[PDB]
Amino acid sequence: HSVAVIGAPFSQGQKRKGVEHGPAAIREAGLMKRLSSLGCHLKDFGDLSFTPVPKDDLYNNLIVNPRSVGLANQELAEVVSRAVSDGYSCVTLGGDHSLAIGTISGHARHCPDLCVVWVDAHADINTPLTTSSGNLHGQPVSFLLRELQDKVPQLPGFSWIKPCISSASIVYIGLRDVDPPEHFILKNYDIQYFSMRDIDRLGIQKVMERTFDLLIGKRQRPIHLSFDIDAFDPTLAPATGTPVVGGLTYREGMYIAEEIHNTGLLSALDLVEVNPQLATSEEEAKTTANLAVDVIASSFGQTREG
Template structure:
């Protein structure tokens, strides 16, 4: 197992969606023992605290179709700089959300160093809406579109300097709720998506083997894992804002991350959408921490 120098960064942001409370996700994950678990695996872990997020929600701009755009941009700009600094220091960024809009900042920061970044996206949703296609205006449903250059200018130009992830380097796993506009963009760009249909049909082992083979063929220079806890079935992760029945099982999720660990390919990760207000005795945060363990070297024997 690789021993890593891990920098943990929390992003207590819940402005990217409509159900408040996910801003407490980083605290819940820390309370579930994330730092202690990773240190026990032999990693050097530095908890660098939280990105500052304004507690005062600004008055919405009627001209903007996106909710809380100012707050989301401000937090993601700070996160992008933090992630870029961590990578330049030779450390492994581990970002704790917060809603999934924080991936805009994470990916913007990573692409300052990685020019051919691979992205594995575990999620019930495609997160590829724009202001024009989004049914809700919630930015947590847009980070992948933004990170490929589609969407509001304030988001697509955020810290990017023209550096975006390549559609060919993106793999979505576990999708089962895709909006019509997202489906159109997926087909237009040729995004690789393993829905729950493929997981049920072929099994998680085959899906992960295909994922790893694909990224190897693309000769990526780093691989980012973005894991939304709603990718799992709500039976295992009840504390998420947008649960969708029929998701990945507890063991399927651990197997996937164990295979990523065996491949030693992951160079950064984020775990998002833990909402303690909706949770049952911090169950979802506990699952997030156990998944981190599988990703970063924990084995039964």
């Protein structure tokens, strides 16, 4: 079992400084030793340096850094594609969530029937025509879903992307801050999600059971787990740019990761939005990074029973 680790210090999908230091923070929290201990053979690609784009002006006076985000993702997709082609399960450390455009695109090149489990407080499914922030980290799913493409304009730097997956191939877990146009999109395209309210009702065991029935109930598929640290309650993961009260507990997050491992199908994992500079103390930053490491290790087989 081989795992590739790619640092992707994306910050230009959003406006808050510091998220580019997430990969270093997660490595410093002992990621590689934890993975080695489980028996993973590792290839560390280090932290990538992405090519900047000069004069990357706003698109439509709103969308920030489109060419930079587009090119960084094109470059990242090439690395992810190569790693998956070489037989590695691919762990990408962020960095802001716009990097999922690149990781999912790269992953889908060799694994076109992948499915996506998107664990997040947010749906990240605004389009360039619905976003009220202009921040691409709150739009990445819109660029990836085939059914949405007539509603998504062509951004500069984005021409290389071709939507990778169907709306029936993504399931959200943890949602508790969704913009009204995103709610419209989720309902209109029948995209399945388990919000925090659904977890309150069903419990995390049934949520995972139903997630897998929707995605792999009738056929095996490589799983892409895109995990935004802000899915966790801010008491547990304070070092992040968009915290929302009332999130996953520690135990719920471990359970999600355990079930992902138990499928035997995990093929790529993103761990995004750790921003150590937003912690009010070193302890806050380190606990957030420690939590990120626990998620990744659990996703690759660390158990709570020995």
